[PDB]
Design an enzyme around this catalytic site. Structure first.
Site, PDB file in Angstrom:
ATOM      1  N   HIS A 112      63.555 106.545  27.027  1.00  0.00           N
ATOM      2  CA  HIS A 112      62.341 107.053  26.291  1.00  0.00           C
ATOM      3  C   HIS A 112      62.276 106.145  24.948  1.00  0.00           C
ATOM      4  O   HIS A 112      63.617 106.164  24.127  1.00  0.00           O
ATOM      5  CB  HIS A 112      62.603 108.455  25.926  1.00  0.00           C
ATOM      6  CG  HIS A 112      61.796 108.978  24.716  1.00  0.00           C
ATOM      7  ND1 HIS A 112      62.342 109.040  23.361  1.00  0.00           N
ATOM      8  CD2 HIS A 112      60.302 109.177  24.618  1.00  0.00           C
ATOM      9  CE1 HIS A 112      61.115 109.319  22.624  1.00  0.00           C
ATOM     10  NE2 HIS A 112      60.024 109.677  23.429  1.00  0.00           N
ATOM     11  N   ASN A 113      61.135 105.568  24.573  1.00  0.00           N
ATOM     12  CA  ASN A 113      61.039 104.661  23.267  1.00  0.00           C
ATOM     13  C   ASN A 113      62.256 103.890  23.368  1.00  0.00           C
ATOM     14  O   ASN A 113      62.937 103.865  22.261  1.00  0.00           O
ATOM     15  CB  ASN A 113      60.835 105.218  22.325  1.00  0.00           C
ATOM     16  CG  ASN A 113      59.518 106.062  22.030  1.00  0.00           C
ATOM     17  OD1 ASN A 113      58.622 105.991  22.975  1.00  0.00           O
ATOM     18  ND2 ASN A 113      59.341 106.834  21.178  1.00  0.00           N
ATOM     19  N   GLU A 142      60.283 102.025  28.068  1.00  0.00           N
ATOM     20  CA  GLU A 142      59.026 102.187  27.544  1.00  0.00           C
ATOM     21  C   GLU A 142      58.633 101.262  26.279  1.00  0.00           C
ATOM     22  O   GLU A 142      59.568 100.791  25.584  1.00  0.00           O
ATOM     23  CB  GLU A 142      59.234 103.895  26.680  1.00  0.00           C
ATOM     24  CG  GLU A 142      57.817 104.057  26.356  1.00  0.00           C
ATOM     25  CD  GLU A 142      57.827 105.787  25.988  1.00  0.00           C
ATOM     26  OE1 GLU A 142      58.932 106.254  26.173  1.00  0.00           O
ATOM     27  OE2 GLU A 142      56.904 106.276  25.512  1.00  0.00           O
ATOM     28  N   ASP A 144      55.687 100.804  23.421  1.00  0.00           N
ATOM     29  CA  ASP A 144      54.756 101.184  22.583  1.00  0.00           C
ATOM     30  C   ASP A 144      54.266 100.176  21.917  1.00  0.00           C
ATOM     31  O   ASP A 144      54.654  99.732  20.855  1.00  0.00           O
ATOM     32  CB  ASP A 144      55.296 102.199  21.542  1.00  0.00           C
ATOM     33  CG  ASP A 144      55.773 103.511  22.248  1.00  0.00           C
ATOM     34  OD1 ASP A 144      55.728 103.697  23.318  1.00  0.00           O
ATOM     35  OD2 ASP A 144      56.133 104.241  21.561  1.00  0.00           O
ATOM     36  N   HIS A 157      57.360 102.621  16.649  1.00  0.00           N
ATOM     37  CA  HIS A 157      56.958 104.101  17.051  1.00  0.00           C
ATOM     38  C   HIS A 157      55.648 104.402  16.129  1.00  0.00           C
ATOM     39  O   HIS A 157      56.096 104.438  14.967  1.00  0.00           O
ATOM     40  CB  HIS A 157      58.069 104.930  16.788  1.00  0.00           C
ATOM     41  CG  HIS A 157      57.951 106.330  17.403  1.00  0.00           C
ATOM     42  ND1 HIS A 157      58.404 107.360  16.591  1.00  0.00           N
ATOM     43  CD2 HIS A 157      56.972 106.772  18.247  1.00  0.00           C
ATOM     44  CE1 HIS A 157      58.020 108.561  17.280  1.00  0.00           C
ATOM     45  NE2 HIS A 157      57.169 108.080  18.313  1.00  0.00           N
ATOM     46  N   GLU A 191      52.756 102.313  26.687  1.00  0.00           N
ATOM     47  CA  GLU A 191      51.759 103.393  25.663  1.00  0.00           C
ATOM     48  C   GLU A 191      50.940 102.299  24.847  1.00  0.00           C
ATOM     49  O   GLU A 191      51.664 101.719  24.050  1.00  0.00           O
ATOM     50  CB  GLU A 191      52.795 104.171  24.829  1.00  0.00           C
ATOM     51  CG  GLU A 191      52.054 105.341  24.125  1.00  0.00           C
ATOM     52  CD  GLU A 191      53.048 105.765  23.185  1.00  0.00           C
ATOM     53  OE1 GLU A 191      54.057 106.455  23.764  1.00  0.00           O
ATOM     54  OE2 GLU A 191      52.705 106.299  21.955  1.00  0.00           O
ATOM     55  N   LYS A 239      53.215 100.414  34.509  1.00  0.00           N
ATOM     56  CA  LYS A 239      52.714 101.716  34.509  1.00  0.00           C
ATOM     57  C   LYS A 239      52.040 101.852  33.121  1.00  0.00           C
ATOM     58  O   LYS A 239      52.411 101.376  32.032  1.00  0.00           O
ATOM     59  CB  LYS A 239      53.983 102.760  34.213  1.00  0.00           C
ATOM     60  CG  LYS A 239      53.449 104.179  34.218  1.00  0.00           C
ATOM     61  CD  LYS A 239      54.560 105.320  33.477  1.00  0.00           C
ATOM     62  CE  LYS A 239      53.797 106.593  32.689  1.00  0.00           C
ATOM     63  NZ  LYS A 239      53.561 106.223  31.118  1.00  0.00           N
ATOM     64  N   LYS A 241      47.708 103.229  31.671  1.00  0.00           N
ATOM     65  CA  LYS A 241      46.355 103.827  31.874  1.00  0.00           C
ATOM     66  C   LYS A 241      45.563 102.799  32.852  1.00  0.00           C
ATOM     67  O   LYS A 241      45.618 101.719  32.187  1.00  0.00           O
ATOM     68  CB  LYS A 241      45.504 104.186  30.584  1.00  0.00           C
ATOM     69  CG  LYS A 241      46.297 105.125  29.694  1.00  0.00           C
ATOM     70  CD  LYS A 241      45.913 106.236  29.042  1.00  0.00           C
ATOM     71  CE  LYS A 241      46.587 107.466  28.938  1.00  0.00           C
ATOM     72  NZ  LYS A 241      46.467 108.327  27.695  1.00  0.00           N
ATOM     73  N   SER A 279      52.884 112.562  33.281  1.00  0.00           N
ATOM     74  CA  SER A 279      54.062 112.659  32.170  1.00  0.00           C
ATOM     75  C   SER A 279      53.883 113.936  31.585  1.00  0.00           C
ATOM     76  O   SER A 279      52.953 114.506  31.367  1.00  0.00           O
ATOM     77  CB  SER A 279      53.827 111.523  30.923  1.00  0.00           C
ATOM     78  OG  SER A 279      53.807 110.385  31.745  1.00  0.00           O
ATOM     79  N   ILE A 408      98.240 113.203  14.874  1.00  0.00           N
ATOM     80  CA  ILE A 408      98.324 112.917  16.658  1.00  0.00           C
ATOM     81  C   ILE A 408      97.424 113.809  17.231  1.00  0.00           C
ATOM     82  O   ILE A 408      97.105 115.190  16.508  1.00  0.00           O
ATOM     83  CB  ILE A 408      99.702 113.152  17.059  1.00  0.00           C
ATOM     84  CG1 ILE A 408     100.834 112.405  16.191  1.00  0.00           C
ATOM     85  CG2 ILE A 408      99.698 112.945  18.470  1.00  0.00           C
ATOM     86  CD1 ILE A 408     101.224 110.933  17.061  1.00  0.00           C
ATOM     87  N   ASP A 410      95.507 116.715  19.276  1.00  0.00           N
ATOM     88  CA  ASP A 410      95.951 118.024  19.808  1.00  0.00           C
ATOM     89  C   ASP A 410      94.910 118.309  20.903  1.00  0.00           C
ATOM     90  O   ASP A 410      93.811 118.912  20.581  1.00  0.00           O
ATOM     91  CB  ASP A 410      95.715 118.963  18.314  1.00  0.00           C
ATOM     92  CG  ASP A 410      96.480 118.449  17.284  1.00  0.00           C
ATOM     93  OD1 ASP A 410      97.861 118.618  17.515  1.00  0.00           O
ATOM     94  OD2 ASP A 410      96.298 119.011  16.335  1.00  0.00           O
ATOM     95  N   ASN A 434      99.849 117.762  19.098  1.00  0.00           N
ATOM     96  CA  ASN A 434     100.458 116.585  18.967  1.00  0.00           C
ATOM     97  C   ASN A 434     100.745 115.862  20.180  1.00  0.00           C
ATOM     98  O   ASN A 434     101.943 115.271  20.036  1.00  0.00           O
ATOM     99  CB  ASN A 434     101.624 116.786  17.927  1.00  0.00           C
ATOM    100  CG  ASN A 434     101.012 116.517  16.446  1.00  0.00           C
ATOM    101  OD1 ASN A 434     100.089 116.952  15.987  1.00  0.00           O
ATOM    102  ND2 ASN A 434     101.983 115.764  15.616  1.00  0.00           N
TER     103      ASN A 434
HETATM  104  O1  LIG Z   1      57.422 109.103  21.700  1.00  0.00           O
HETATM  105  P1  LIG Z   1      56.848 110.570  21.497  1.00  0.00           P
HETATM  106  O2  LIG Z   1      56.435 110.642  19.874  1.00  0.00           O
HETATM  107  O3  LIG Z   1      57.485 111.526  21.863  1.00  0.00           O
HETATM  108  O4  LIG Z   1      55.260 110.601  22.088  1.00  0.00           O
HETATM  109  C1  LIG Z   1      55.146 110.332  23.701  1.00  0.00           C
HETATM  110  C2  LIG Z   1      56.370 109.777  24.075  1.00  0.00           C
HETATM  111  O5  LIG Z   1      56.317 108.308  23.735  1.00  0.00           O
HETATM  112  C3  LIG Z   1      56.232 109.533  25.826  1.00  0.00           C
HETATM  113  O6  LIG Z   1      57.425 108.758  26.267  1.00  0.00           O
HETATM  114  C4  LIG Z   1      54.917 108.939  26.115  1.00  0.00           C
HETATM  115  O7  LIG Z   1      54.550 109.316  27.446  1.00  0.00           O
HETATM  116  P2  LIG Z   1      53.529 108.457  28.503  1.00  0.00           P
HETATM  117  O8  LIG Z   1      53.207 107.318  27.901  1.00  0.00           O
HETATM  118  O9  LIG Z   1      54.147 108.399  29.712  1.00  0.00           O
HETATM  119  O10 LIG Z   1      52.330 109.296  28.631  1.00  0.00           O
HETATM  120  C5  LIG Z   1      53.682 110.029  25.205  1.00  0.00           C
HETATM  121  O11 LIG Z   1      52.529 109.275  25.601  1.00  0.00           O
HETATM  122  P3  LIG Z   1      51.221 109.925  25.327  1.00  0.00           P
HETATM  123  O12 LIG Z   1      50.776 111.262  24.573  1.00  0.00           O
HETATM  124  O13 LIG Z   1      49.820 109.168  25.009  1.00  0.00           O
HETATM  125  O14 LIG Z   1      50.774 110.629  27.160  1.00  0.00           O
HETATM  126  C6  LIG Z   1      53.853 110.023  23.950  1.00  0.00           C
HETATM  127  O15 LIG Z   1      52.921 110.850  23.296  1.00  0.00           O
HETATM  128 CA   LIG Z   2      97.368 116.679  15.498  1.00  0.00          CA
HETATM  129 CA   LIG Z   3      56.407 105.998  23.154  1.00  0.00          CA
END
Ligand SMILES: O=P(O)(O)O[C@@H]1[C@H](O)[C@H](O)[C@@H](OP(=O)(O)O)[C@H](OP(=O)(O)O)[C@H]1O
Ligand SMILES: [Ca+2]
Ligand SMILES: [Ca+2]
EC number: 3.1.4.11
Length: 513
Positions: A112-113, A142, A144, A157, A191, A239, A241, A279, A408, A410, A434
């Protein structure tokens, strides 16, 4: 002393005992005695002369004994301390599973991120973060994307003070490390917050940088299901939209069309298409698991679902992945930069199958008509109770758990069962004061595991401290079916998942029905 001290410090009674047992009167283990040990104690299924001989050939230090098809105590120890004596099945440390099923049939290593090195609000972002994850076997990354100066999209972020980096720089790094740890497909979760123009730049960079690695078209015949990891070997897929969004980008989204959760349903009318992915935040996923575990499960049979951490986890803390895997969720994204039991368990699971990042799900979770619900357990294939007995015998050279150089350790050991809720358990030994060199516990615990196929056993060693929180010394998490029996050494990892070459636990494991 010259020896006394030397060999006495380097003396391991528990090993002596074990050897004596396997050997009896004799001062060595004949192939026959060895094979007996392998079968009776180590419960090897390939137990036989062939295995015994290869063990001897490989580990016996004595030339005499080697040539004469025998194993000395030393060879016994060496085998025990080797990859073959490892509590984590050496056999599972290579890709051995069926890599020809649709992606939705595997748990996928996901982050994630990924760009973040620290917290979610002000910490730094870096291409390094991607390299690290990739080197840890992560498959789903991921990105962004936001508009940047000079018309070059940047990554950071959204709405925070996190440092920034370039989208292109990120792609090169990915390009370079995508397959260092595995040959299986990498998925980039985009994203997208980019303007139409910068989206175009994104697509350009993608194509230009990823080139042929990039999957920009459906595979032949990939009609009714998602392609398998094999079919996608060496590829990176997008992956995001799919048609605010330029076609250049949108057209590169083939198998992972980001979608909003609709709901689950039997026909093809309302439970998205195999190439559609929803998601869920940790919170939402939990609710759905809470209310419609089986729907989610069934849903996850032919559809990929991504779960990501709750918004309050601004410290980049992680949730337990197990709870999501118990629902068949495959793209369970964690913050790879954060050490903890969660990443411990995560990387334990993914050490499986050669560490390739795709672990085949249990059949009952690959059955579109399963009635499984980890939350409401009923009779079915998943029900296969086992009795696990784990004896924590001793510890060897436990790492100096970060103090200075005069106190040491424990040490104390904790053994946990992670899996379906009813199986979760935790037990701990007493503290040996120890002694980090060769603490001896000789404690046995027993657990009953009803759905082993979803279980992992974790060993954690802490440095006890009355005054403060006990220091984490080392850990190891082993997927149930990779748990080897008999006498084994558990090779301890650091907070960061790094190996501790000499840090081990000597245990005896038994799994009965
Ligand atoms: O980082 P945060 O602050 O936790 O925000 C969400 C996070 O980044 C997720 O990985 C992401 O999932 P997806 O891209 O898979 O959707 C989601 O996108 P989204 O809300 O636009 O769906 C974000 O809102
Ligand atoms: Ca100790
Ligand atoms: Ca993200």
């Amino acid at each position: 002393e010259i020896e006394t001290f030397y060999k006495m410090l380097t003396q391991r009674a528990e090993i002596d005992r074990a050897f004596e047992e396997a050997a009896g009167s004799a001062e060595t283990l004949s192939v026959e005695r060895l094979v007996t040990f392998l079968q009776h104690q180590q419960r090897e299924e390939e137990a036989g002369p062939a295995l015994a001989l290869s063990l001897i050939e490989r580990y016996e230090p004595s030339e005499t004994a080697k040539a004469q098809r025998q194993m000395t105590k030393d060879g016994f120890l060496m085998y025990l301390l080797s990859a073959d004596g490892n509590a984590f099945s050496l056999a599972h440390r290579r890709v051995y599973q069926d890599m020809d099923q649709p992606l939705s049939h595997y748990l996928v290593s996901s982050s994630h991120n990924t760009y973040l090195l620290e917290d979610q609000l002000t910490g730094p972002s870096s291409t390094e973060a991607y390299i690290r994850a990739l080197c840890k076997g992560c498959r789903c990354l991921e990105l962004d994307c936001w508009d940047g100066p000079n018309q070059e999209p940047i990554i950071y972020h959204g709405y925070t003070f996190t440092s920034k980096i370039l989208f292109c720089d990120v792609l090169r790094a990915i390009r370079d490390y995508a397959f260092k740890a595995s040959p299986y497909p990498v998925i980039l979760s985009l994203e997208n917050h980019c303007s139409l123009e910068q989206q175009r730049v994104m697509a350009r960079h993608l194509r230009a940088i990823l080139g042929p690695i990039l999957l920009d078209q459906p595979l032949d015949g990939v009609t009714t299901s998602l392609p398998s990891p094999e079919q996608l070997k060496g590829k990176i897929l997008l992956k995001g939209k799919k048609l605010k969004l330029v076609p250049e980008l949108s057209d590169m989204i083939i198998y992972c069309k980001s979608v909003h959760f609709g709901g689950f349903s039997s026909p093809g009318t309302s439970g998205q298409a195999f190439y559609e992915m929803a998601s869920f935040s940790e919170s939402r996923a939990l609710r759905l698991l809470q209310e419609s575990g089986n729907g989610f499960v069934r849903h996850n049979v032919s559809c990929l679902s991504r779960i990501y951490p709750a918004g309050w986890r601004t410290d980049s803390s992680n949730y337990s992945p197990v709870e999501m895997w118990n629902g068949g969720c495959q793209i369970v994204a964690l913050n790879f930069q954060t050490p903890g039991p969660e990443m411990d368990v995560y990387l334990g699971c993914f050490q499986d199958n050669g560490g390739c990042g795709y672990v085949l799900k249990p059949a009952f979770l690959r059955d579109p008509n399963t009635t499984f619900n980890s939350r409401a357990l009923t009779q079915g294939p998943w029900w296969r109770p086992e009795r696990l007995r784990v004896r924590i015998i001793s510890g060897q050279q436990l790492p100096k758990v970060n103090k200075n150089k005069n106190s040491i350790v424990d040490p104390k050991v904790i053994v946990e069962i992670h899996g379906v809720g009813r199986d979760t358990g935790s037990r701990q030994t007493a503290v040996i004061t120890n002694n980090g060199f060769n603490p001896r516990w000789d404690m046995e615990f027993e657990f009953e595991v009803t759905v082993p196929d979803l279980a992992l056993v974790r060993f954690m060693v802490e440095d006890y401290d009355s005054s403060s929180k006990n220091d984490f010394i080392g850990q190891s998490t082993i997927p149930w079916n990779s748990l080897k029996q008999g006498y084994r050494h558990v090779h301890l990892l650091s907070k960061n998942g790094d190996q501790h070459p000499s840090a081990t636990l000597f245990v005896k494991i038994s799994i009965q029905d």
